[PDB]
A paper describes a structure:
Jasmonates are phytohormones that are pivotal in mediating plant responses to various biotic and abiotic stresses and regulating plant growth. The first crystal structure of OPR3 from tomato (SlOPR3) showed that the enzyme crystallized as a self-inhibitory dimer in which the L6 loop, a critical loop involved in substrate recognition and coenzyme binding, from each protomer intrudes into the active site cavity of the other protomer. Based on these observations, it was postulated that the formation of the self-inhibitory homodimer represents a mechanism for regulating OPR3 activity and, thereby, jasmonic acid biosynthesis.
Variant Y364P was produced to test whether residue Y364 is required for homodimerization, as proposed previously. Even variant Y364P, lacking the putative phosphorylation site, was crystallized as a self-inhibitory homodimer, indicating that Y364 is not required for dimerization. The slight difference between the dimers arises from the protomers being differently positioned to each other. The sulfate binding sites (R343, Y364/P364, and R366) are the same in both dimers, and despite Y364 being replaced by a proline in Y364P, one protomer in Y364P has a bound sulfate ion at the same position as the wild type, indicating that R343 and R366 are the main binders of the sulfate ion. In the other protomer of Y364P, no sulfate ion is bound. We previously demonstrated that this sulfate binding site is instead a coenzyme-phosphate binding site responsible for NADPH binding and the enzyme's preference for NADPH over NADH10. Thus, it seems unlikely that reverse phosphorylation of Y364 serves as a regulation mechanism in vivo.
Numbering used by the authors:
A (entry chain A): 10 to 385
B (entry chain B): 11 to 384
The structure:
Amino acid sequence: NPLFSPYKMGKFNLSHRVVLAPMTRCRALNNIPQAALGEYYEQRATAGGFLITEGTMISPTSAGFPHVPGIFTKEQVREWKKIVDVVHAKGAVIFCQLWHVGRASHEVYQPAGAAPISSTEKPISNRWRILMPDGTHGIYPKPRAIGTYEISQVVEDYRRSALNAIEAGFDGIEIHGAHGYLIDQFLKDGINDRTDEYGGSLANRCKFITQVVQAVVSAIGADRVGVRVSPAIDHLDAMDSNPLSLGLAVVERLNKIQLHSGSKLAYLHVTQPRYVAYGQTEAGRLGSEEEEARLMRTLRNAYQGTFICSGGYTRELGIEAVAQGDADLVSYGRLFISNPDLVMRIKLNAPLNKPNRKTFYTQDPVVGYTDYPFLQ
Amino acid sequence: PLFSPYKMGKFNLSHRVVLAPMTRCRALNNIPQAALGEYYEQRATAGGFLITEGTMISPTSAGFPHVPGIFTKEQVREWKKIVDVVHAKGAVIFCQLWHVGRASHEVYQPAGAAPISSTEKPISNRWRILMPDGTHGIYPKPRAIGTYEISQVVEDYRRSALNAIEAGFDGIEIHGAHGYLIDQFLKDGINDRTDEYGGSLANRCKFITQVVQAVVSAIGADRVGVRVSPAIDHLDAMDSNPLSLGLAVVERLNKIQLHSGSKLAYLHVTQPRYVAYGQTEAGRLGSEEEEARLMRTLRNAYQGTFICSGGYTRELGIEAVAQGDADLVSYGRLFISNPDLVMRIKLNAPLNKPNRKTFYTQDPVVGYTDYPFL
Ligand SMILES: Cc1cc2nc3c(=O)[nH]c(=O)nc-3n(C[C@H](O)[C@H](O)[C@H](O)COP(=O)(O)O)c2cc1C
Ligand SMILES: Cc1cc2nc3c(=O)[nH]c(=O)nc-3n(C[C@H](O)[C@H](O)[C@H](O)COP(=O)(O)O)c2cc1C
């Protein structure tokens, strides 16, 4: 089982290749990490295993979900430190994902009910919904387009949050530049309609993610920085006219950052689109995902360093990805929600608990969070 | 409530369990075989309603192997034998008229022509076609047909509908769903035409209106059912506003009924079951409530019998009829593996698991009619 051959991710000697994908769960009440998070990440930590936290706020304006943790205040840092200590006690490596939603927010999540910030004034269309604090679904409002100065302040929020994560004891951070959030709002030409030096060409559209990565690399070192992107996922109207070209341009910037810094990043993390097959249709189970596979392998071949694949991976797909050289590490999301001992279940090819979507984003510290059972 | 009677036109149905149309590829050389007889006989019940596999309307309408036709008198003769057996069991049977459009390959095109469609855009390579040798092939580039050719395809529907009535079928169902030929005109993600059949919502509904009106003018509205799927993720068949498109189709069908002076047999709607973007943060937010609203909005809008389909279970089918969401519920995969599915649902008995490996094989017995009874 190639998922359990050790892997050297920089200085980290990982004992297996099963990674906990970053997953918003909304148990960090009032943006403060709670004890439930410690019990949740401890359940899933393994000796030599790699974990990535839920997306974490970098500033008071970065949230678009209720009760997501932040790491921009010293109070949040003190509470994160307790969680890192229990994860490290089990011998696991853990990175904190730094998350800014950009236009994917609502006035209810913004200080003084202000507008969410973005690269554009275009809102997300009504084909997408936002989760409101009372559990209902809301409409994304019109965002405010930020200028160069404010862009450098958002970059500074990433750098201070990166420093705060290191103060908390995290082994590194991951930049959330995927899924149509703030960084992806500059990357995707279906969103970025700017005419200044941050819009238009591929080079200008990659300027914001280059500035973010370069700032955190200059603050804590390239070895402690992972980068997550999703060029071929159009979540929240985040489409690009040539996703492979965009992905390759991003990879080129990362290779250049590594060359100028003289050090490699921790990894490149890419989520792929994963069209579920329709067993109720005539030809739903006849299609192949080979074009999506070629795009992921192209990005992997283009990037000089560790590659983590994600999105709809099973035990079989994860084994196949590592065995064929398509990826070094495989991150699991939904199956890791419902299986605290997912690594052991994958090791043993054991049955997997089904995830209950109704409790993905509720606030209970136990129900649907830490009460998923272990193997008997 | 699934076994409370329902009057579908002149037909007094004894239960609400319907055999959904299902391609099985046992009609060797496009001629219905005796195996189809046993298959449908096994599943026919007194007062039950059956819908056949998709049936070719022309030599260019197929995109699967060993699929039956109704465009030849030979086909008509073999169909008659099947209908008689089903009728002997006391069941009503409709024949589904199927044109795959761009969803064809070429080992199925007589003159090795390009599949006809509303557009020249092909299906993307993430979908594959089943080849006669059992492998999977790539969909080729289709040919966009002009205004005159559209009237010939409508005539193929009319001639095939007459042939099905000659075979003894109680009616026909128009397959305008799942991204096939009719759906290729409906969906604005496929229809990029600039003539009177493309652009506005009304222009995209012109083709399905003409097809439905033609078969109604040939065999009567009471013997015509219509199947659509505005919110289906099959073969790149997306529409920017599935609710508007569904209501526009319903308005056309209601108007056809008003001018014809008779109601249609039924409206048959396939249900999305949205599982897309399950790996994203907010993709599944408000995806089950909008699908629920969509099915009910169309049901309230259509003046006549409503049939829902797709992934329905015993529990889900009971809830749909009890809550007024549908008059009839058609079952697919569970009816493959349970010949006495109606009897098993009546008794709440265990259900055999369907074997997907034998869904499209050619054997007349294995994986087709060898599923056991209760
Ligand atoms: C409930 C939920 C929350 C998620 N939150 C985040 C997140 O905060 N940041 C992020 O980059 N990805 C997030 N994801 C995407 C996952 O990290 C990962 O890409 C995906 O779950 C992998 O697909 P899988 O569930 O089939 O394993 C989330 C996914 C789910 C289902
Ligand atoms: C193997 C198979 C073949 C099918 N063939 C057709 C077909 O030829 N025409 C059609 O309109 N629907 C076809 N369908 C869709 C069914 O009519 C129906 O929508 C679906 O099977 C119901 O979902 P269920 O199987 O979970 O009950 C097919 C479905 C399956 C599984």
